[PDB]
Write a protein that binds this ligand. Structure first.
Ligand SMILES: CNC(=O)[C@H](Cc1ccccc1)NC(=O)[C@H](CC(C)C)[C@H](CSc1cccs1)C(=O)NO
Ligand SMILES: [Zn+2]
Length: 411
């Protein structure tokens, strides 16, 4: 049992990171506001780690990470020394404790955002928008689209994915597409059925780019750079024909002729079918052409797009809650799952449940409502906050127009 190790390792890392950042949001906001923390507990069970801060805060860690808390100085929960009252939770104005309670979920969302922004820089793999077929008597039929072609830029905006293609087609007709062999063309032009286009697997030359070790292709003599010119005496021209011959012949020997180093090499390969379905042949090769696009982002935009993705996630959670009442493998997927679980936690722990942060939010909101000893004061902040807004959004609005100058008739 070795997969168990990495699995529970990722589980513990995810849970620890989420709980630790929630409690650290609570702790750091309370500390910056002037509230002294008494205990910083992460996980349930018996303490496996324990250390006292210079401010008497006891950070403790237990081995079952399913929750945690941050206990502050509070007269409602115990005796407070006369010299510690100015650092007590309850001795602060109501808005301070409101922000302290709100800090947790916010923290979660914040983490989500940054994690999303972290995976938008590393590069995300999407599927190439490869038009496999064209329909008759459609808008694309008169325009004569290419059989097997890849979209490059529709109506000006450069797209590298299918979802991006449909989002551009609903954003707004010029279509720059790349067919096999010949160069890009701006064709004089599901949802694509309105136009007469169909998507599918990418096609190309029967050239080899990868050959797995100890595979039937490697044992038969296939090498990288080989271009299969014929299978069983029949000449082929597309990678799809090659994979057709491979799948249709599980265990039967195929006699290939490949173009290699300027000459022609004859080979023999016996593709073997896998365990899940011993009806589809397989020998272990990859096409020399790519079928993946790599979406990259600048981090100054990756942050905003991760925020938008978190908003999409929380609206999805809202839809799911109202109803209730591509593959980019690697660690990059683990980080996405971690951020999604973080969003789930930041949503669920904000529900007006008595012992959760939402219940505390409700309690301090009704306490603020009951406590109205001054007028025209609540309005005062109402401007002093907005000022900051109309200042900070100004600063960026300045900096934005500053960064466009730093960039800037050849033909
Ligand atoms: C997966 N665990 C949770 O989501 C629970 C609540 C819960 C349990 C079961 C079902 C649904 C929700 N949340 C928390 O433990 C919060 C910290 C999490 C967000 C890291 C915690 C809520 S209070 C307390 C929990 C235990 C003792 S005191 C908090 O706000 N600290 O600042
Ligand atoms: Zn909390």
């Amino acid at each position: 049992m070795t997969d168990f190790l990495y699995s529970i390792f990722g589980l513990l890392i995810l849970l620890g990171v989420l709980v630790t950042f929630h409690e650290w949001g609570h702790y750091w906001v309370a500390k910056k506001l002037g509230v002294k923390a008494l205990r910083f507990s992460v996980g349930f069970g018996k303490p496996i780690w324990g250390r006292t801060n210079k401010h008497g805060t006891e950070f403790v860690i237990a081995p079952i990470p399913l929750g945690g808390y941050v206990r502050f100085v509070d007269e409602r929960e115990g005796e407070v020394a006369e010299a510690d009252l100015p650092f007590a939770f309850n001795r602060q104005q109501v808005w301070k404790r409101i922000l302290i309670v709100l800090a947790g979920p916010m923290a979660n969302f914040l983490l989500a955002i940054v994690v999303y922004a972290a995976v938008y820089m590393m590069g995300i793999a999407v599927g190439k928008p490869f038009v496999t077929n064209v329909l008759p008597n459609t808008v694309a039929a008169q325009a004569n689209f290419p059989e097997n072609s890849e979209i490059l830029s529709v109506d000006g905006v450069q797209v590298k994915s299918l979802e991006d293609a449909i989002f551009a087609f609903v954003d707004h007709i010029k279509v720059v597409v790349k067919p096999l062999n010949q160069e890009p063309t701006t064709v004089v032009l599901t949802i694509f059925d309105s136009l007469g286009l169909g998507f599918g697997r990418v096609n190309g030359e029967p050239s080899l780019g990868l050959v797995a070790k100890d595979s039937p292709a490697e044992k038969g003599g296939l090498k990288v750079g080989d271009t299969v010119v014929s299978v069983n005496g029949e000449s082929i021209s597309l990678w799809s024909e090659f994979v057709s011959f491979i799948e249709n012949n599980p265990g039967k020997p195929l006699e290939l002729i490949v173009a290699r180093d300027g000459y022609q090499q004859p080979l023999v390969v016996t593709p073997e079918a896998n365990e899940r379905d011993r009806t589809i042949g397989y020998l272990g090769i990859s096409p020399a052409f790519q079928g993946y696009n790599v979406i990259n982002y600048g981090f100054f935009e990756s942050f905003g797009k991760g925020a938008e993705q978190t908003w999409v996630m929380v609206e999805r959670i809202g839809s799911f809650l109202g109803k209730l009442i591509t593959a980019q493998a690697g660690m990059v997927a683990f980080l996405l799952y971690l951020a999604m679980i973080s969003v789930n936690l930041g949503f669920v722990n904000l529900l007006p449940i008595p012992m959760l942060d939402g219940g505390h939010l409700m309690y301090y909101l009704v306490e603020l409502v009951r406590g109205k000893p001054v007028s025209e004061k609540i309005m005062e902040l109402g401007m002093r906050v907005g000022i900051i807004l109309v200042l900070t959004i100004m600063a960026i609005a300045l900096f934005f127009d500053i960064n466009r100058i730093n960039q800037l008739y050849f033909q």
